[PDB]
Design an enzyme around this catalytic site. Structure first.
Site, PDB file in Angstrom:
ATOM      1  N   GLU A  55       0.855  -1.171   0.000  1.00  0.00           N
ATOM      2  CA  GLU A  55       0.000   0.000   0.000  1.00  0.00           C
ATOM      3  C   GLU A  55       0.900   1.232   0.000  1.00  0.00           C
ATOM      4  OE1 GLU A  55      -0.499   2.757   1.860  1.00  0.00           O
ATOM      5  OE2 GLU A  55      -2.106   3.406   0.491  1.00  0.00           O
ATOM      6  N   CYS A  89      -5.996   5.003   5.759  1.00  0.00           N
ATOM      7  CA  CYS A  89      -5.715   3.836   4.935  1.00  0.00           C
ATOM      8  C   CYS A  89      -6.985   3.054   4.605  1.00  0.00           C
ATOM      9  CB  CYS A  89      -4.745   2.910   5.663  1.00  0.00           C
ATOM     10  SG  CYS A  89      -4.038   1.584   4.644  1.00  0.00           S
ATOM     11  N   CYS A 121      -5.834  -1.240   5.396  1.00  0.00           N
ATOM     12  CA  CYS A 121      -6.193  -1.492   6.788  1.00  0.00           C
ATOM     13  C   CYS A 121      -7.348  -0.568   7.177  1.00  0.00           C
ATOM     14  CB  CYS A 121      -4.997  -1.352   7.734  1.00  0.00           C
ATOM     15  SG  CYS A 121      -4.289   0.313   7.812  1.00  0.00           S
ATOM     16  N   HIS A 145      -8.040   2.443  11.870  1.00  0.00           N
ATOM     17  CA  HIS A 145      -7.929   3.818  12.352  1.00  0.00           C
ATOM     18  C   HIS A 145      -9.258   4.331  12.898  1.00  0.00           C
ATOM     19  CE1 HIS A 145      -3.764   4.313  11.128  1.00  0.00           C
ATOM     20  NE2 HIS A 145      -4.078   3.654  10.004  1.00  0.00           N
ATOM     21  N   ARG A 187      -0.736  -4.985  10.662  1.00  0.00           N
ATOM     22  CA  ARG A 187       0.695  -4.738  10.514  1.00  0.00           C
ATOM     23  C   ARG A 187       1.361  -4.362  11.839  1.00  0.00           C
ATOM     24  NH1 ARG A 187      -2.500  -3.794   6.561  1.00  0.00           N
ATOM     25  NH2 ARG A 187      -1.767  -4.603   4.551  1.00  0.00           N
ATOM     26  N   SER A 243       3.371   0.614  10.550  1.00  0.00           N
ATOM     27  CA  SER A 243       4.361   0.824   9.506  1.00  0.00           C
ATOM     28  C   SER A 243       5.270   2.017   9.794  1.00  0.00           C
ATOM     29  CB  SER A 243       3.713   0.936   8.156  1.00  0.00           C
ATOM     30  OG  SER A 243       3.238  -0.354   7.743  1.00  0.00           O
ATOM     31  N   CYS A 291       2.665  -0.429   4.541  1.00  0.00           N
ATOM     32  CA  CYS A 291       1.531   0.421   4.228  1.00  0.00           C
ATOM     33  C   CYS A 291       1.962   1.873   4.471  1.00  0.00           C
ATOM     34  CB  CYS A 291       0.353   0.008   5.101  1.00  0.00           C
ATOM     35  SG  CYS A 291      -1.164   0.869   4.659  1.00  0.00           S
ATOM     36  N   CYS A 332      -0.491   4.541   5.762  1.00  0.00           N
ATOM     37  CA  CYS A 332      -0.389   4.335   7.206  1.00  0.00           C
ATOM     38  C   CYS A 332       0.857   4.973   7.824  1.00  0.00           C
ATOM     39  CB  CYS A 332      -0.444   2.843   7.524  1.00  0.00           C
ATOM     40  SG  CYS A 332      -2.138   2.295   7.833  1.00  0.00           S
TER      41      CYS A 332
HETATM   42  N1  FCO Z   1      -2.393  -2.698   9.457  1.00  0.00           N
HETATM   43  C1  FCO Z   1      -2.337  -1.577   9.193  1.00  0.00           C
HETATM   44 FE1  FCO Z   1      -2.181   0.165   8.667  1.00  0.00          FE
HETATM   45  C2  FCO Z   1      -0.351   0.102   8.873  1.00  0.00           C
HETATM   46  N2  FCO Z   1       0.805   0.115   8.997  1.00  0.00           N
HETATM   47  C3  FCO Z   1      -2.503   0.582  10.369  1.00  0.00           C
HETATM   48  O1  FCO Z   1      -2.730   0.806  11.455  1.00  0.00           O
HETATM   49 NI    NI Z   2      -2.720   0.674   6.171  1.00  0.00          NI
END
Ligand code: FCO
Ligand code: NI
Ligand code: SF4
Ligand code: SF4
Ligand code: SF4
Ligand code: SF4
Ligand code: FCO
Ligand code: F3S
Ligand code: F3S
Ligand SMILES: [Mg+2]
Ligand SMILES: [Mg+2]
Ligand SMILES: [Mg+2]
Ligand code: NI
Lengths: 551, 267, 268, 551
Positions: free
Chosen positions: D13, D60, D63, D67, D478, D501, D545, D548
């Site tokens: 991502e 994101c 994912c 969030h 992640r 990330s 990601c 992210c």
């Molecule tokens: N999984 C995911 Fe996105 C990332 N890095 C978040 O939180």
């Molecule tokens: Ni993400």
């Protein structure tokens, strides 16, 4: 000798009783009896012609769609209405997808447990079972692993002590001839079939508004609003959705259903030599594609004394030869008027007096075509197509025969199709050819919309005086269907349905001649008169629908 | 061990059984293998004739007080019940016997719920509802022609999972499915409100998804969940969404009584 | 047969617009890429990386000049000469303008590319703008939502492929089949609105009877889209309001990401 | 030395650049760079705390859900709200089903083409391929016939001359070690994966209102109206529908994804000996099941210097040790303030000055835990579970190892999990254990509703004066996610997201220490510096990601 009753016959639609005289271990004489009546012809009488289809659709929920379509065609016949071609494409897709569902369910859920022993499947080696289908099928769900999962489900069901729908089946019966492995194959396919038929009905639902019992027809066309740029109507997104389900049907039909048909034949070759019900056959052409209720994709015709070479084609639903031939008698039925009646002049006056071998013994009427008993449905339909020299039908039959030959080293001749297994084969061939109908008619619809034609409905006018007669023909899953409507002073003054199972299941006629079910059973060997599996095998091959037969 | 079900069809078209073959939660294969034990159902039973009759009697004894009885179709009383005879006896007798030992009784479909199409017009066979045949029993009504199968399956699941029926209205219909008029939860209400009406199939308004009141929509006088739950679990599929008025098939005195194009009364 | 080529460039994207495709059923993403189109450039799925995927882009732009559909998700940041999104050492605005030169059709998928979306909201830290703003001489087809139902995109592409031109568009260049009507002018809770039957708090009696969510801040009255009809995920009955939450106006510039969840909409 | 740039890194991502110094065909030094920023932390500032989740969810869309959940948890932390248990069950089902989709897509659609050569797959014998999996998997779609269908799709794609997403891949690269047969197996599984991930997201959609980007949360609980007897709300029919999709996930996860994980390891054992990113690991407990934001189904903890035996358990999202340890630096990032900042005191002031090897080279910040670099995500999460002595985790790892042993004759020790393949294994274990989370939480919900609890939401009060602070932790696909909200005079005065990330991809920190991605690449052999597949293999194992990482 002895007299047996099979009541209820299960794994059909509706309420059927079969009686048989057995002499020296062979059926010598049989009676077929529809044991439930509603009077749907009377319920619909005296209404506006436009309202009939929503009522008479409820003749049957198995062959849903068919009575709805026949009814609007009857009204359109009476009123001289040319159905918009888009409405034909939509009607055709619904019928083809419905019939796909219908036929799959018949072969598996209704018929397979006549030929398949679930107990024997427990003894199968899944790997051997998978090996048996190499070079016979390219289906992607015939692994030992699939078969093991299925075998474990059967194991768990049996272990539970609650067999339910499988309880007291004909496990171990001498007429059960499949090896354990082929029994397991069939049960796996039985379960896989349920997903394929679900997809077929998703096609139906997206055009019909739901299934069972579609709700998108009208006298004058269909209620679907074609507008590629419209929100909430039949746009390109909805059409794409329809297409996604159409495309999911072919593989199972071609690689499982068609193959299993040849497999059952290969293990039961004697069933190509019994179960002949008639020497005359009728089907009507189906899937019209022009703007004038014609140009059918499938041909129809009449075969007399099993002579394909001299059959009479039927290419129009207005064919006077077809129309004038059809009558029904109630001599051995529980109605008052017994002489043969043309359906525009038909009556349906109940006159129940109990069962009598020589008198009245059924709620089903006895149809004739120019005084003859006739078999309708997939055997009729396939034979007529072969007589027409339809290449697609000969090619599809040849594929089934090629598998049979691979398994047995023997071929099949046309003479052997006049049988229980021939009938089953005709149905399979139909299911296979219908996938091309779906592709053809989806493409036709997309193309026609592209040319700017979004027309779906022509509003009818119905004169408030005059008497007008109409007939709606339809080649239904179980054979030629016809709805006969008389309009007088703007309302329905007579309504008669002559339904495919009426033709096949009808009792002895005005001249005491025997109908297809009754004839097909003569000569059936019965190993155990208490458990007459062999009788039910032949009867099931006609796909009985008794809500249809009697209405 | 799975909860036992006994299904008897009277004057049925089989559409109510066929609803199950569209179901997804559960699918019919998971229903019969995992959710219930379907102890009697003539459409799917391997056994026929004397053998299937044995299954019925065995099940009625073994599961006395425990099984759910389900009936589709109307029950004909005219002429001593002879308009539906199974194994030589009127279906009303088979039903009354099975009702004696039932833990719960369900009329699936408009036919068993209130007589339906089979009892319409002059009612040739004196067809009546399951409740009318069982005056001393509580019958759960799941109408429609046929209902969304999950109207039935979620009712059965409630009985199994929580040990009692779902809440019912004063027609004994489950409120989760029949608690509201279609017109009081219909996505075309804005069009109704604005006078935006289809007048004929295929006209401009119809082709913009306008309200179908003037085509004879019976949503204003029909209780159900057709606009919300809809049908076949594909999304967006019910009669009105496809372009056709509701006919009132759920509702006694509407479906099979009023003409398609006859206008509904609006409360 | 040859399949129509598509070039997909992500700018200031969260990848939700690509992810929409993995929920699609008609076509599924596997049928999209194997049967419906040739997806000549898409960084989320491409086997090639770095210099190799850069070659794929150039080769595709040349081979399919005048033929490909260009698709962009995310906003395009213009502040500080484009440095808030740099791919292979160059501002994404430059990659997009180059790809637009040879495009047969240009589609902004999602609210970010359609009108700036969340990325351009509030103080707009990066001077994010819409695709149409970066391509003033081009007709950009806008498919808003955060993200849209993937079929809002897929049926637009199919129309171009099948019938050789875009679907009908409104005056924001949104396809009418998906964005031609206010959600509130085709919402199944309109009867409740009309009767004054309103949820006041999540979990209250009315909310638990499926009443109208206007007084929870539903933006259906000022948002164009098909959320109430097409809905999401093709399972039936699934859109925010059906699940119990007001429309936030994510489709509609000046509503989503501007108005508070519980702020009341203006009703026409 | 030679200098290479990989820009863009695909099959992640977001927007990533990786630079490497190579000495004699071995990476000696690496730089990770997030090349796109939006300023989502600044966009959400000065709003009502209740509005944050709908905005920051858009950090994101891969994912998705994460969030949104972290944001409401942060607001609930600030406000001291105890979330109703039904809201927890629903949040938990969404997160578990989402993560199932996420992990499946990562292994197949994002990662597999690092290890799998589609060209080689064309040379496979489908029967041999199927045979290789006997006694390794019970999956029902590993037949030669399935594999042949898949092989033919690849053949047709290549023959078309339009490779699309497959064009210019690393076919024939010396690091590609799978035999043709295993390549074909993987491609088949890649396509099958897409159906399983679709079913996972149907679960998410039925509770979230859609996916991507759910819309059923609130500060205070969820917007789902629980009423078994209600029309148009969350009733038993809807719950049954959710269950139908939950039940469809397990078989693919257990019989395909888990098995393929072992298979890839078996063919690539050197990848158990490289790709170590850190010696410290963090995860937070997840899936709370009480009425006080606690009683997690999965444990969390902190591992220092790879010593499981002395790890520190974390059992609460209010753990002061966890909260106080977390800081971020922008010394080598494109922001102004460089000293380590606790996120409640964080700033995000852009200060782009172009790329510099020794200066600023990323939009990603540099997180530390009490001044140390830490790896988060599935490796961390598995190791912590093993340190906790969680039997479910040890058992699931043992199953993967048993398959690996069957294929290689070798076992795996914990020391070998600190690697590219160990990381992949941790993700697979997670996906497997999440299926039990789903069953557990569905049952909990049904049970709780049965006891009469239909509560889903506690309306917040937000004081109009005062300054107060909250943190929402979440164990994301992640790794550990945290949202940090400061409220002043009723609106958000500071918002800082520290995203998994961010931990892994962050550039050199305030003390010039190297983060996990950069450290993991030291020692990577690169056969062809023009085509550094080996580098991308290790980076992909972290499931980058960058939307992210940077926000
Ligand atoms: N999984 C995911 Fe996105 C990332 N890095 C978040 O939180
Ligand atoms: Ni993400
Ligand atoms: S309710 Fe409708 S579908 Fe069910 S038996 Fe009666 S006519 Fe058939
Ligand atoms: S009349 Fe029918 S279509 Fe119009 S709003 Fe009412 S229920 Fe909907
Ligand atoms: S429109 Fe929404 S889903 Fe699409 S890139 Fe923007 S934030 Fe993501
Ligand atoms: S305010 Fe929202 S929920 Fe209410 S009728 Fe309008 S769009 Fe529907
Ligand atoms: N098929 C079918 Fe039903 C019957 N018989 C009709 O028509
Ligand atoms: S006709 Fe029946 S199926 Fe629903 S839409 Fe009306 S109640
Ligand atoms: S928030 Fe967006 S997804 Fe539809 S329901 Fe409202 S426009
Ligand atoms: Mg007109
Ligand atoms: Mg008749
Ligand atoms: Mg941050
Ligand atoms: Ni029928």
């Amino acid at each position: 000798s002895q007299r047996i009753t099979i009541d209820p016959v299960t794994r059909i639609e509706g309420h059927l009783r079969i009686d048989c005289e057995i002499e020296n271990g062979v059926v010598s004489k049989a009676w077929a009896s529809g044991t439930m009546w509603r009077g749907m012809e009377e319920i619909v009488k005296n209404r506006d012609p436009r309202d009939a289809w929503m009522i008479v659709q409820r003749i049957c929920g198995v062959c849903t769609t068919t009575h709805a379509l026949s009814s609007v065609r009857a009204a359109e016949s009476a009123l001289n209405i040319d159905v918009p071609v888009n409405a034909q494409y939509i009607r055709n897709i619904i019928l083809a997808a419905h019939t796909t569902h219908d036929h799959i369910v018949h072969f598996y859920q209704l018929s397979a447990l006549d030929w398949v022993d679930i107990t024997s499947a427990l003894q199968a080696d899944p790997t051997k079972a998978s090996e048996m289908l190499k070079g016979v099928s390219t289906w992607h769900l015939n692994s030992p692993e699939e078969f093991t999962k299925v075998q474990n489900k059967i194991k768990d069901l049996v272990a539970s002590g609650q067999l339910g729908i499988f309880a007291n089946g004909y496990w171990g019966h001498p007429a059960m001839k499949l090896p354990p492995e082929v029994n397991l194959i069939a049960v796996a396919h039985y379960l896989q079939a349920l997903e394929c038929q679900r997809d077929a009905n998703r096609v139906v639902a997206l055009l019909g508004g739901k299934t069972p019992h579609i709700q998108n027809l009208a006298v004058g066309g269909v209620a679907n609003p074609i507008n590629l740029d419209g929100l909430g109507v039949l746009n390109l997104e909805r059409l794409m959705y329809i297409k996604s389900f159409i495309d999911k049907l072919s593989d199972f039909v071609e690689q499982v259903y068609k193959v299993d048909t040849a497999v059952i034949a290969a293990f039961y070759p004697e069933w190509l030599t019994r179960g002949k019900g008639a020497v005359n056959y009728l089907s009507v052409p189906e899937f019209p594609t022009d703007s004038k209720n014609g140009s059918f994709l499938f041909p129809g015709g009449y075969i007399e004394n099993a002579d394909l070479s001299s059959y009479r084609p039927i290419t129009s639903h207005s064919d006077e030869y077809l129309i004038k031939g059809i009558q029904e008698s109630a001599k051995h039925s529980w109605y008052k008027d017994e002489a043969p009646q043309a359906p525009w002049e038909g009556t349906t006056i109940p006159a129940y007096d109990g069962w009598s071998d020589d008198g009245k013994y059924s709620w089903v009427k006895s149809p004739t075509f120019y005084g003859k008993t006739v078999e309708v449905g997939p055997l009729a339909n396939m034979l007529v197509k072969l007589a027409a020299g339809r290449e697609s039908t000969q090619n599809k039959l040849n594929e089934i025969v090629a598998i049979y030959q691979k398994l047995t080293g023997n071929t099949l001749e046309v003479a052997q199709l006049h049988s229980t297994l021939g009938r089953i084969i005709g149905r399979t061939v139909h299911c296979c050819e219908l996938q091309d109908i779906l592709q053809n008619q989806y493409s036709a619809l997309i193309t026609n919309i592209g040319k700017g034609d979004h027309t779906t409905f022509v509003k009818p006018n119905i004169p408030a005086t005059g008497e007008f007669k109409g007939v709606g023909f339809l080649e239904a899953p179980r054979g030629m269907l016809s709805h006969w409507m008389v309009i007088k002073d703007g309302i329905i003054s007579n309504y008669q349905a002559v339904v495919p199972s009426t033709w096949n299941s009808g009792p002895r006629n005005f001249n005491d001649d025997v109908g297809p079910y009754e004839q097909s059973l003569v000569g059936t060997p019965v190993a155990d008169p208490n458990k007459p599996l062999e009788v039910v095998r032949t009867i099931h091959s006609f796909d009985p629908c008794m809500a249809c037969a009697v209405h | 061990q799975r909860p036992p079900v006994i299904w008897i069809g009277a004057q049925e078209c089989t559409g109510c059984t066929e609803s199950l073959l569209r179901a997804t939660h559960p699918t019919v294969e998971n229903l019969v293998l995992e959710t219930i034990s379907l102890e009697y159902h003539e459409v799917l039973s391997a056994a026929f004739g004397h053998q299937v009759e044995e299954n019925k009697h065995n099940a009625l004894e073994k599961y006395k007080g425990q099984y759910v009885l389900v009936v589709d179709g109307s029950i004909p009383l005219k002429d001593n019940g002879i308009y539906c005879m199974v194994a030589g006896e009127p279906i009303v007798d088979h039903i009354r016997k099975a009702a004696e030992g039932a833990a719960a009784i369900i009329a699936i479909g408009s036919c068993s719920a209130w007589g339906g199409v089979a009892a319409a017009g002059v009612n040739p066979t004196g067809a009546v509802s399951l409740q009318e045949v069982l005056p001393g029993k509580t019958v759960i009504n799941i109408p429609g022609c046929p209902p969304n199968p999950h109207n039935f399956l979620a009712t059965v699941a409630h009985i199994i999972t929580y040990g009692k029926p779902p809440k019912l209205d004063d027609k004994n219909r489950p409120t989760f499915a029949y608690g509201r008029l279609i017109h009081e939860h219909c996505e075309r209400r804005p069009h109704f409100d604005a006078g935006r009406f289809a007048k004929e199939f295929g006209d401009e308004g119809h082709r913009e998804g306008w309200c179908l009141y003037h085509l004879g929509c019976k949503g204003p006088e029909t209780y159900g969940n057709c606009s919300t739950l809809q049908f076949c679990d594909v999304g967006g599929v019910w009669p009105v969404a496809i372009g056709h008025p509701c006919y009132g098939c759920n509702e006694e005195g509407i479906g099979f009584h009023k003409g398609i194009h006859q206008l509904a009364n609006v409360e």
